[model samples]
Target: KTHVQLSLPVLQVRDVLVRGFGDSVEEVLSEARQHLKDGTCGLVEVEKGVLPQLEQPYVFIKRSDAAPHGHVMVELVAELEGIQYGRSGETLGVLVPHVGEIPVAYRKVLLRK
Candidate 1:
């Protein structure tokens, strides 16, 4: 018998690794606000109806399930609302652009009337 040779292709899969917030909620928000000013992030229009001063700068610590977009972030729930210093807890919220405002429980609560 003579000699035979065969070649096969190899597939490579890439892994995704995410970075942590770095500092606490407070420090992150502060940096984020500066990032906003430095053009590192985008301009954010905070929700004032549900919570006043929301239009101002605020930082968020995403939950286990979250997605990043631009600088404002997307598909995330704040682990704690940074009224001043970042709190350590989970709150329900989503980041959208120009969608107008709705009640906090608009989708979560049911009307009984």
Candidate 2:
């Protein structure tokens, strides 16, 4: 009897690691604005003919009424949603470019509206 040898292809699956910015609102927004200046605020595209990895930068904030101090958490959500071609959606990215604290006086004014 004659035996035949065969070879099969091996498929390698890469693991994905997620990262985030663990800083105060001021610090986080600071770096985000700089990225906008460098024009790297949008998505990173892969080379031609390569499958694009869909990843997005998301900002999440939770607000609470009860606090140890007389302060409330304000969530600032911003994103430059897009595809490999470029930005494909509108964003509030250009709204808050200044670096400063929101006045405590406006808390009541903002809350009413």
Identify the candidate with maximal lDDT: 1
List the candidate 2 regions with Cα displacement exceeding 4 Å: 1-18, 43-113
- The digit string of per-residue lDDT tens for model 1 on 1-113 reads 12111111111111101122234555545554343234232222234442232332334323222222212122222224344443333433322221222222211111010
Candidate 2 local lDDT, 1-113, one digit each (tens): 12111111111112212222223444545554453344332221123421233223333222322322333322234333431222222221121222232222222100100
Clashing residue pairs in candidate 2 are: none
The TM-score of candidate 2 is 0.24
Q: Kindly report which residue pairs in candidate 1 clash with one another.
A: 79-89
Predictions: Cα RMSD each: 21.8, 23.7
The per-residue C-alpha lDDT of model 2 at residue 20 equals 25
lDDT of model 1, residue 8: 12
lDDT of candidate 2 at residue 56, scale 0 to 100: 36
Give stretches of model 1 more than 4 Å off: 1-21, 42-113
